[PDB]
Design a protein around this nucleic acid. Sequence first.
DNA 1: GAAGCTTC
DNA 2: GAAGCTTC
Lengths: 5, 5
Amino acid sequence: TXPGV
Amino acid sequence: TXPGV
DNA sequence: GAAGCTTC
DNA sequence: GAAGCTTC
């Protein structure tokens, strides 16, 4: 994902 | 990333 | 270098 | 299952 989430 | 980008 | 989820 | 970048 993101980086992060 | 995303999904997608 | 661990650290990943959901496109399509 | 190919398909990934940038945190920290």
